[PDB]
Amino acid sequence: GSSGSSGADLGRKITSALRSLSNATIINEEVLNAMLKEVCTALLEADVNIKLVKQLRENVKSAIDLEEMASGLNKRKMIQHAVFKELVKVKVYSGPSSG
């Protein structure tokens, strides 16, 4: 079963992931790493090439900073958005990009 044609379930697969953070209190490299396995999946369940999804995690993890992050709800924010943001990137097609 599946109604509509666009996705939905997609962001829903990741949503829960990112949502796993808002709940999480620790928040560390592991988390992202773990949560990633939950996100990277969605992408993998989309069509994106593993080689890409393998470059996303980094581009994402690198977009953050677990190597050194005191503490702040922001982290969970900038993180929850970071990902949701990267999803927008995923290798621009030909928009407002500067290589």
Token pair recorded at residue 81:
């958005």
Q: How was this structure determined?
A: NMR
Say which CATH number the domain at 59 has.
1.20.120.140
Give 23's DSSP letter.
H
Alpha carbon of 31 to those of 6, 94, 95: distances in Å?
29, 33, 32
Is residue 60 within 8 A of residue 36, CB to CB? The reply is yes
Q: Which domain holds residue 55?
A: 1-99
Token pair recorded at residue 84:
């949701």
**Block residue for tokens 């994402």:** 60
Distance, in Å, from the CA atom of 24 to the CA atom of 83, rounded to the nearest integer, reads 16
49, exposed or middle or buried, with CB in 10 Å at 0-12, 13-18, 19+? exposed
Q: How many domains does the chain have?
A: 1
Instruction: For residue 82, give every residue at least 6 positions away whose Cβ sits within 8 Å of its Cβ, in sequence order, or none.
Output: 60, 63, 64
